[model samples]
Target: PKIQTYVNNNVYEQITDLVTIRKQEGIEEASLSNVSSMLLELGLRVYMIQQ
Candidate 1:
């Protein structure tokens, strides 16, 4: 394994909808899985720009 998971979480709708929060910020995506895809960046930062 490249690393280890110290914590386990199931990303859910109520907690991680990740919208504007209506409390005001500019964060929004359709869903939690979308957030996760960006979280890993699907290797974009690895091969393309992250040096």
Candidate 2:
């Protein structure tokens, strides 16, 4: 529950900021795809730890 709250309040904001910055910087589609992959990896690691 704490993690969920932190993710909703903190992680979401950070992710939004990163997305905005990337867009402003004219980031490539490949970079966004790479970041998405990295985020999926992070989610998997967290899920494993929770298990």
Candidate 3:
């Protein structure tokens, strides 16, 4: 079956939102980059994380 969902839940969007927040608070790009990587390592397992 074909899936129908919004990209709003995608990793890119999640990372973008987080990065935007960090930028607003004056966090360094390096820290934000690390955050993105960390999020990717953990974010790839969204299903388990949700549980």
Name the regions of candidate 3 deviating beyond 4 angstroms.
1-9, 30-32, 40-51
Candidate 3 lDDT over residue span 1-51, tens digit each = 333333445765676778778867887573545666666568669968798
- The model with the greater TM-score, 1 or 2, is 2
- Lowest lDDT block of 10, candidate 2: 1-10
Tens-place lDDT per residue, model 1, 5-24, is 23245444443645335224
Q: Give lDDT tens digits, candidate 2, residues 1-51.
A: 112223466766667677667777886443534555667779899999999
RMSD of 1: 7.5
Candidate with top TM-score is 2
What's the CA error at residue 23 for candidate 1, in Å? 9.9
lDDT of candidates 1 onward, in order: 0.48, 0.63, 0.65
